[PDB]
Structure formats: structure tokens, C-alpha cells
Amino acid sequence: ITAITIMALYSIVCVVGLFGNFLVMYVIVRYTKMKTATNIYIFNLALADALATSTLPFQSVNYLMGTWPFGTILCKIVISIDYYNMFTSIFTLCTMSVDRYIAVCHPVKALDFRTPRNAKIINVCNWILSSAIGLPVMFMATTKYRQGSIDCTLTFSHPTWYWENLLKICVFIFAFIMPVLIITVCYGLMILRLKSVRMLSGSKEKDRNLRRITRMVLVVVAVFIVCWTPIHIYVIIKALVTIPETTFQTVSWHFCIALGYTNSCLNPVLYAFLDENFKRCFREFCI
Amino acid sequence: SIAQARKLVEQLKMEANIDRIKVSKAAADLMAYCEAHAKEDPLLTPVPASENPF
Amino acid sequence: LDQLRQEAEQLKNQIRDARKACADATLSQITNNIDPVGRIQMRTRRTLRGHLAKIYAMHWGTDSRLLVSASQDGKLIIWDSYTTNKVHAIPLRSSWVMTCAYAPSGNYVACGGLDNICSIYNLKTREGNVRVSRELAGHTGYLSCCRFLDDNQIVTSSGDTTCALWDIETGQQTTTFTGHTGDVMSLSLAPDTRLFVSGACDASAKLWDVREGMCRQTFTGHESDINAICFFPNGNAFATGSDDATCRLFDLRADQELMTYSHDNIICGITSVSFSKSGRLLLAGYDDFNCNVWDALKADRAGVLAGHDNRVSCLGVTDDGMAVATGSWDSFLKIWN
Amino acid sequence: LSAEDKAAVERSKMIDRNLREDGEKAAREVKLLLLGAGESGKSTIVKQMKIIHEAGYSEEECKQYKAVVYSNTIQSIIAIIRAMGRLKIDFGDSARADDARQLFVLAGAAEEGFMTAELAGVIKRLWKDSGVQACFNRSREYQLNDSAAYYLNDLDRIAQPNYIPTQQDVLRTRVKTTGIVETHFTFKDLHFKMFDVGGQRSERKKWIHCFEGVTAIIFCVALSDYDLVLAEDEEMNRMHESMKLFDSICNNKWFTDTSIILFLNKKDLFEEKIKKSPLTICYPEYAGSNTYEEAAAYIQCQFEDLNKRKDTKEIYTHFTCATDTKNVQFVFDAVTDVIIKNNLKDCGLF
Ligand SMILES: Nc1nc2c(ncn2[C@@H]2O[C@H](COP(=O)(O)OP(O)(O)=S)[C@@H](O)[C@H]2O)c(=O)[nH]1
Ligand SMILES: C=CCN1CC[C@]23c4c5ccc(O)c4O[C@H]2C(=O)CC[C@@]3(O)[C@H]1C5
């Protein structure tokens, strides 16, 4: 009995996440402030999070019922949007890392790429790359009305042993091996640049905000890594070691799925926890 | 000293002797100038995109 | 000896009841029938970026396309606001500059500040780069404002409570305007270029004749230092902005204040004032990161120009009146339509 | 989009490249703002930083100060003579009245100090008079130049026809300026720009926000002003005026993150003045002894108590004698080391 008393928490978390993401999208549009490249990157991350959390009730219907009456195209877009928010969140955080690298470590030439046109181009082409790598799961999504249960998991053409694990390996090596390594080496370069020598006696007022932004980006990256590592290592050890099934293994899997999904709701309260740009708007509207 | 104390008295002497028109007439003249040149003020009548160089 | 004040005060009373004698109406009472301007919003069409310190003063041009802006970083940038370019970047001998000016011919740029020297830089060298041509000296205080009259005469104001009219070629003070008991902070030139007003920290604005050289009228009413002044476009009124968070529209013919522009929950001083082409809209730069857009006849807030991180410090409306340029301490100029 | 105005864009790019280089250079320097009341030694500190961190003074720069030195000596001796009228002091000799009249006769010119043989003789004769020395010894009852004794004591070598000012002669020159005086030097691989607004006869409020963001404020307070008086109301002291000026500057909203370095200047006069004039003239509530160490510590304590942000910002106090190159050098080394370690404290990770 783990399905009747568990849907309320999922529904509350998903509605709080979508409300926070909607409030984030609301406070960047047609405002004189909220224009810089990092903030529109946070906009892109928030819309990806909103797209992730909008499909939480539609996924939870099959758990709270055991039947999938939604439709063929309906599961064609929920498994495709799941590879969306996994791939483009670590690539948005990857472009945040190279944005901070070209700002602090790099010289004043940072005022040659900070223009929002290049940031929008980077965001659009990043989504293009994510959709180009995610079109196979649009192509190969269907629902099978099996006698044991109903399922619409991803299938493969000519499986042998060349298409059932190469996808898992390629996803794992292009979600944590590729971008987290460059993120970690970029923060290493950032810390050595910032703490090998002293700092110039410049505009502290316009530098404390930059330091706070870098701190918030580092906190976002750290919470994303700690909330997305266990599910990926569980996937790898499931697909390679293939341990025999157990009750506590299933409990661990169902816990780590929610731990992976909770990033979409943790982020809007995270970057608004300590930041003066959103706090006065929140205080004005909360009255 | 005495020269400074006499300078502002001389200035107030030459300042109170001017002719003052009524507030109503001057304000009406300001109003009439406001309507007379209102059609050539792009801030009052903002064209969206046609003749604005910006 | 001590009986000069007891008749200076009766001269003041004569002035005040002569003003009250001809005050049978007011501007707000007769403009109850003119239609309101509604809400006048303006979008930032251009964002002139490239300064690295607090911009302190800017001035437009007669061609209404180029402009000059002076910043704390010792830079006079002569821009090209159509394409957002940087035509010139003049380095200053002293980075302490509080005012800048573009000549109406467009061939000269004045700057000045805490160095107490008004530097006239020639833009049409006919040989090479922009270099200094005149260094007008003689002030004993910070240069607060300077407007060109033509290529050979300039009017400046200083913190030694005097204004001056300089001949550039001889380099001397042709005329000196005294009478202020506080530091002059801003002067505005009349459109007919024969009179000019100047507001000082003694909470008063004085009207001066350039050709003769004496004060004619002294307008009071403000409760703090006047930081800004601007003639109404017909040359027969002028608005003043002060540190007591009010603007005032004084009239040279009625010799008194007609209108006050103020609102509750506004406590910051006014740094700049300017008028539109027709003078219907009065633009006032504030210290609360906003540039209010008042109606000069209804005394109500038509619009607001937000978008500056730091204090708005200088305003400018073009000769053809299309755009408003707003400088600020966050090193950004903004163009509005 | 394939236009002819590519030249304007390239010129703008060259402009912003040069401007970015200049901004990088300007962000990598230490800005010191010298503040304080009048006759507190700010310009002498400027000249000392010129001496230490540059070539000093050349033959032309020394020879251009000779007329100003002569004018300062003439002004100090005229002030000393004219103080006899307001102090009612009899001359030691009857010929000193004729000497004073002759001094007024030869000081008719108001362009520059001449200091001919006759002027040298008359000032030397007036300098040995007991009444003149007595009037100089009661200088606290009126206004006198602080370098009067130094200039008039070596009057024999000053008044030579081929006299060239030395480092101390240029250094102890009381000269009036109008604009802001800023000097450039380099020290400990750091460029220093120093500013002074002492000659700025204006309102301090209207430009004190122009120095927001400076690295340090060196507030020069002369210790020898405790026994002096102000000749405007006969109820205000120069030390109290300097104290309230420091209270304004230190607790100003523009200097929240500025290092305040107090320079308690003219301690060498304070040592020779504390033995005779008590500190109770300035502070009526003083209960300590009339010794130099306790009095200097008390003035430092009062100036530190003028602060209202002791738990956030620390005032770095140093005693200086601004005409001593070695003491100024040592105090400036301490100041630069404090600035450098506070800049390392500004370096952090987040
Ligand atoms: N005996 C003695 N005299 C000193 C010392 N330091 C400075 N002075 C003198 O004090 C006067 C005002 O100086 P200054 O011009 O800088 O004023 P200011 O710019 O602050 S308004 C100058 O004539 C200096 O010789 C010192 O240690 N000992
Ligand atoms: C934390 C939830 C994100 N999920 C996305 C889809 C999937 C998944 C993840 C990682 C890599 C995959 O290839 C992959 O496909 C799926 C799978 O095989 C089971 C685990 C997941 O539901 C999970 C994380």
C-alpha cells in the first residue's frame, strides 16, 4: 500500500513548482530590470523546469490508477519532455559556467559577448541540440497493452545488444561525464584566479552583486549535482551490474526518482532565497 | 560691509520697479503656446515606428 | 548702518505685495478645461553604453543626433545617438568634471568641474585629433554648469557664488554676474540667447542679462538648494528643481511662481529638469532612480522613465524634440521616444 | 548590413578598446583623499609624497618658490608687528616704532616679496627686540602663520642675494590654491593618486559625494590647534571644529567602505606647547596631567570616540610631523601596508 496516500505530496510539490516557475516567468517580461544574460538563462532553466513539472500529474495518473488511457501521442510527449529537462538543464548550467568563465577569469572583453542577442542565440541552439538528440524518443515512443500491465516505455529497432544499452551509456556520458567535468574544471580555474592573488580596489558596490551572482550559480550547480547524481549511478548499476530485485531497492528507486524531480521546485525558491531583485516584488505582491 | 549692505538695497530698488503683468494673462499665453506647438512635439504624439530615427 | 535692513525688508515687502497684487488667478485654476495627457510611456530605444564611472552631465546638439557626456572617469564621450557610436573620447587633464556642453555650431565642447577651469576643446581640428584650445581660468570654486552662447562667448557658473561671461579668444571674463549668497548649481540659457537664469543653494533663481550684466528678477519659493533649471521653450518662463523634492514653474512676466510639481512619497531631490519641444511635458530627473514626466499645466504625473540602476543626474531633450536622453551614475545613458 | 559606415563602427571600437584599457589601469590604483581643517598640513603631505616617490625638487622648482618664501616671511612679520596694536605691548627699544613704519613703507608693493638689503636689515633689527619676541611668544591670542619662527629665525640665510630654497624651505611654504590638487606617484607596485580640496571655497556637501569609492581618506588634524582661538565669535576652538568635521566625514554615507587614516600632524609643536599651555584650554573636562603622551592619547581617544561605527570600521591613527621626511615616510609605509592587507582582506571566495 504505497499509492493512495502518496499522490497528495506529489501534487503539492508539482503545483508549488509550477506556481514558482510561473512567477519567475512573470517577473522577467515587460520589466525595465531583469534583462542580463544570466537572468534570461535562469528564465530558460525555469521554463524547462515548468515543462518538467507540468507532466508530473500526467505521469502520476498511471501510478495512482495503474492504467494509461491518455493516448498514443500523450505518452509520446511525456517521455520526450523527460529527456528534455534532463539534457537541457545540465547544458544550461554548462553555459552558466562558461558565462562566468568569460566574465571573471577573462578580462574586460566580457563586455563583448554579454549582449543578450548572443545569449538568446546560445539558448536557441542549445534547445536545437537537445531536440536533435531527443528526436529518437519522439520516433520510438508507443504504448503496449500488455496483459500483465500497461506501459509506454522506449522501444528499439533491431535490438540485439547494440540499441538497449548504448542509449543508456550515451546518455550517461553526455550528461555527467561531458558537462560536469568542464563545470568543475571551470570552477577550479575560477577559484584559483580569485584566490591566487589579491583583488583590485575597484567598484565594490558593483562587484558585491557579481560575487553574490557567482555564489548563487555555484549553489545552483551544487544542488543540481547532488540531486541528480544518485539516480544516474543507480541507472548505470541497474544496466551494468544488474543486482537481483529487492523491496528496499525498489524503495530506493522510488525515492531517488522524486529526488531527481524535486530540482524543478528547489530552484525557484533557491535563487529567490537570497536575492534583492525578486524579494521586493514578492513583498509587494504578497500584501 | 557697508558696500555689501547697500548693494542688495540698490538691487531691490531696481527690482521692484519693473512692470508685472497678471498671472492670468501670462498663464493663458503659456497655455496658448502649449496648444500652438503641440502638433510638432513628438513626445506628446508618439509615432510608433514611421519617422522616429530611434 | 543698521537701518539698511529695516528698509531692505520693506523693499522685500513691496516686491511681495506687488507680486500678490497681480496674482488674481493661477495656472492650475484655468487649466481645468484642457484635456489631460493621459499616460505617456516611453521605451528605451537606445542604451548608450561605454562609460566606467558615474556620468555627471550630458548635453545634446543642435543637429539632435550627436551628444556629449562627461563622467567621473575623466572622459568626455561625444556619441552618435542614431547608431550608438562613439565619435570622440576626450581625456581630461582633471578627472573631476561636473558639467559639459556642446556648442550650438557643433565645433566646440566645454567641460569643467572641481579643477575650477572651463576647458574648451576644438572638435574641428582640420589636422588631427581633438585637443584643448582654451582653458578659461578665474573662478574660485567648482564649475557647476556652462552653456555656450556661440563659438566666441560662453556663460559659466561656479561655487564661489558667481556666474561669468567669457570671451574665448581673449580668454578673459568679459562679464561677472554676482548677487548670489549661495553656490550656483545650474544655469539655463534663454532661446533668444540674451537672458539666462541661474539657481543657487540660497533657494533662489536669478535672471540675468548677458549684454548688460546685471540681475533683473530674483525668484524665491524653494526650501533647499536648487540643483536644476531650464527655460520654457518660448523664453518667458522657467522650471527649477530643488533638493526639497519639488519642481516649480516661475514666470518672467508675472514675476512669480505659477505652479508647483510635487507628489507624496517623493523625498529625494531633483538633479535635472528639461522641457519638451512644446513645453507641455516637463521632464524631471530624480534621485529615486526615476525620471518623472509631469504635465506642465495640470501638475500631474503623466509618465515615469524607469530603468536606471543609480541616480539620474542629467537630462536632455533634442532641438527637434523627438527623444529624451537620461544620464545616470550607473554609467549608462538612455534614449527615449 | 553591408553599409559604408563601417569606418564609424571601427572608430567606435578603437575608442572603446582604448577606454577599456584606461578603465583597467584606473581600477588598479589606490586613491587617497586628503581632508581636514585649515592649516593642518595637507599640502605639506602632498609635497612630501612628491619628495619621497619622485625626484623631489629640481633647481627650477626650488627657485620658483623664492618669491613665495619672501612673501610668507613678510606676511608673518607684518602679522607679528600688527598684533602689538591689538595686544598693547610696548616695544623694547624706541627705534622699533620707526623700524615698523619703515617696514610698512617698504611693504607697499603687493606683487611679490622683494627682500632687499634694507628690508633684511629692518626685519633683522625687529627680530631681536624683546617686545617682538614676547609678542611672538603669545601667538595663541591671535592668528599667526605656523612657520613664522622657522622663517624668521634663519632670516640671515634667507635674505641672501643668491639664496636658493632648500627642501625644508619649499616644504614649509604656506601657499594658497584654488582648485583641487592631485599628485601621481608609485609605491609598492601600486599607483597612488592623491587629492586635496583644501582651497575649495565652496559647500562641502555639493562635492563630497564625488569622492565616493576612494580607497582611503587621510584626515590631517593639527594637534597644536588646541590652544588656538577662532577670531569670529571668541567662543569656538579650532580643535572642536576639526573634531566636528571629522565627525561629519567619518560618519558620512559616502564613506561606508573607506579606510579612515587619521594623521595627528604637528606633534613636534605639540611637544613644545604642552609643557606651557595646558590641554584644559580646549577640553575643560580633562583630568590627566599636562604631559605630551597623555595629551596625545587623549586627543586620539576623543577623535576615535567621534566615530559611530567602531564595530564595523576601524580608524588608523598615526602621529606625524609633516616637515620630517623620515617620519612621513615611515607613517606612509604603515598606511600602505594597512591598505594592502585590507585589500587582501577584500580578496575572498564565494
Ligand atoms: N612646525 C611645523 N609646521 C608644520 C608641520 N606640518 C605643516 N606645517 C606647516 O603648517 C602650515 C600649514 O600647512 P598647509 O599649507 O599644508 O595647510 P593646508 O593645506 O592643510 S590648508 C605650513 O606652513 C606648514 O609648514 C610640522 O610638522 N611642523
Ligand atoms: C529522475 C527522473 C528522470 N528520469 C528520466 C528518464 C529515465 C532516465 C534517467 C537517466 C538516464 C536515462 O537513460 C533514463 O531513461 C529513463 C530510465 O531508464 C529510468 C530512469 C529515468 O526515468 C530517470 C533518469
PDB file of C-alpha atoms and ligand atoms in Angstrom, chain A residues 82-83 86 167-168 171-172 228 231-232 235 253 256-258 260-261, ligand 2:
ATOM      1  CA  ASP A  82      11.645  13.904 -19.715  1.00  0.00           C
ATOM      2  CA  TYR A  83      14.775  13.724 -21.870  1.00  0.00           C
ATOM      3  CA  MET A  86      17.409  16.236 -18.098  1.00  0.00           C
ATOM      4  CA  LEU A 167      21.413   4.686 -25.365  1.00  0.00           C
ATOM      5  CA  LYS A 168      21.905   4.497 -21.584  1.00  0.00           C
ATOM      6  CA  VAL A 171      23.035   9.497 -22.088  1.00  0.00           C
ATOM      7  CA  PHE A 172      25.236   8.931 -19.022  1.00  0.00           C
ATOM      8  CA  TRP A 228      20.953  14.257  -9.962  1.00  0.00           C
ATOM      9  CA  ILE A 231      19.565   8.459  -9.963  1.00  0.00           C
ATOM     10  CA  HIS A 232      22.197   8.293 -12.712  1.00  0.00           C
ATOM     11  CA  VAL A 235      20.651   3.663 -13.638  1.00  0.00           C
ATOM     12  CA  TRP A 253      14.456   3.781  -6.750  1.00  0.00           C
ATOM     13  CA  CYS A 256      15.657   8.775  -5.972  1.00  0.00           C
ATOM     14  CA  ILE A 257      13.148   9.411  -8.780  1.00  0.00           C
ATOM     15  CA  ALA A 258      11.461  12.053  -6.614  1.00  0.00           C
ATOM     16  CA  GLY A 260      15.774  13.864  -9.166  1.00  0.00           C
ATOM     17  CA  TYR A 261      12.433  15.514  -9.946  1.00  0.00           C
TER      18      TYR A 261
HETATM   19  C1  LIG E   2      14.844  11.253 -12.175  1.00  0.00           C
HETATM   20  C2  LIG E   2      13.998  11.063 -13.187  1.00  0.00           C
HETATM   21  C3  LIG E   2      14.489  11.252 -14.603  1.00  0.00           C
HETATM   22  N1  LIG E   2      14.214  10.021 -15.383  1.00  0.00           N
HETATM   23  C4  LIG E   2      14.387  10.289 -16.824  1.00  0.00           C
HETATM   24  C5  LIG E   2      14.183   9.009 -17.677  1.00  0.00           C
HETATM   25  C6  LIG E   2      14.989   7.813 -17.107  1.00  0.00           C
HETATM   26  C7  LIG E   2      16.497   8.043 -17.204  1.00  0.00           C
HETATM   27  C8  LIG E   2      17.295   8.686 -16.321  1.00  0.00           C
HETATM   28  C9  LIG E   2      18.666   8.756 -16.664  1.00  0.00           C
HETATM   29  C10 LIG E   2      19.137   8.186 -17.851  1.00  0.00           C
HETATM   30  C11 LIG E   2      18.272   7.541 -18.716  1.00  0.00           C
HETATM   31  O1  LIG E   2      18.742   6.980 -19.895  1.00  0.00           O
HETATM   32  C12 LIG E   2      16.936   7.471 -18.385  1.00  0.00           C
HETATM   33  O2  LIG E   2      15.884   6.879 -19.067  1.00  0.00           O
HETATM   34  C13 LIG E   2      14.883   6.620 -18.041  1.00  0.00           C
HETATM   35  C14 LIG E   2      15.223   5.313 -17.294  1.00  0.00           C
HETATM   36  O3  LIG E   2      15.823   4.442 -17.835  1.00  0.00           O
HETATM   37  C15 LIG E   2      14.778   5.166 -15.866  1.00  0.00           C
HETATM   38  C16 LIG E   2      15.253   6.365 -15.032  1.00  0.00           C
HETATM   39  C17 LIG E   2      14.641   7.644 -15.631  1.00  0.00           C
HETATM   40  O4  LIG E   2      13.239   7.547 -15.509  1.00  0.00           O
HETATM   41  C18 LIG E   2      15.113   8.940 -14.916  1.00  0.00           C
HETATM   42  C19 LIG E   2      16.636   9.249 -15.060  1.00  0.00           C
END
